[PDB]
């Protein structure tokens, strides 16, 4: 039964029995979404500019195949991350990390 099951979501809907908190979190999530949209559209806008500056082609499908093929190869050959294979940002970041003599921890989720 829905009533007995999940305790009828008596408190599984409004944290601390305060619907306001639920709304605040919902809005917060929406605020992040709005910011995300701006960034998402920002990349699209920048990408469009790159497309306009550069030549136009319809080899999108072929490009996708290259990304998939290089992506799998990159993982397998992670030990040897060629600069050419990586993007300019990746190569730049690598040099920057070395400059700081080990920038950041370099590890995710310490354990």
């Amino acid at each position: 039964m829905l009533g007995l099951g999940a305790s009828d979501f008596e408190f599984g809907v409004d944290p601390s029995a305060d619907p306001e908190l639920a709304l605040a979190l919902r809005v917060s999530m929406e605020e992040q979404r709005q910011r995300q949209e701006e960034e998402a559209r920002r990349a699209a806008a920048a990408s469009a500019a790159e497309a306009g500056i550069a030549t136009t082609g319809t080899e999108d499908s072929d490009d996708a195949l290259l990304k998939m093929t290089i992506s799998q190869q990159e993982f397998g050959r992670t030990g040897l991350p060629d600069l050419s294979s990586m993007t300019e940002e990746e190569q730049i970041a690598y040099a920057m990390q070395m400059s700081l003599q080990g920038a950041e921890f370099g590890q995710a989720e310490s354990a």
């Binding site: 305060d18 908190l21 605040a24 979190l25 919902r26 917060s28 605020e31 992040q32 910011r35």
Partner: protein, 78 residues
């Protein structure tokens, strides 16, 4: 001024009104609470921050939550 810690502006929304606060991107929630508490003349023990769908407290950090400049935080006093 190539300083690592860059000041960020976060829009704090409260049941009374909304006010933007500028604080170091590497600042802690406790520091942010202090700034907000001053503006609203409230207490860090009565006001609670909300972001990313989670409540932010002193044990939490601004950058730790990904709160950078041009961000929107939800302040809840109660």
């Amino acid at each position: 001024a190539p300083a690592e810690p860059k000041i960020i502006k976060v829009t704090v929304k409260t049941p009374k009104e909304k006010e933007e606060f500028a604080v170091p991107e590497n600042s802690s929630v406790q520091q942010f609470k202090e700034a907000i508490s001053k503006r609203f003349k409230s207490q860090t023990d009565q006001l609670v921050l909300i972001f990313a769908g989670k409540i932010l407290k002193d044990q939490d950090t601004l950058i730790q939550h990904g709160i950078h400049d041009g961000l929107t935080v939800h302040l809840v006093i109660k």
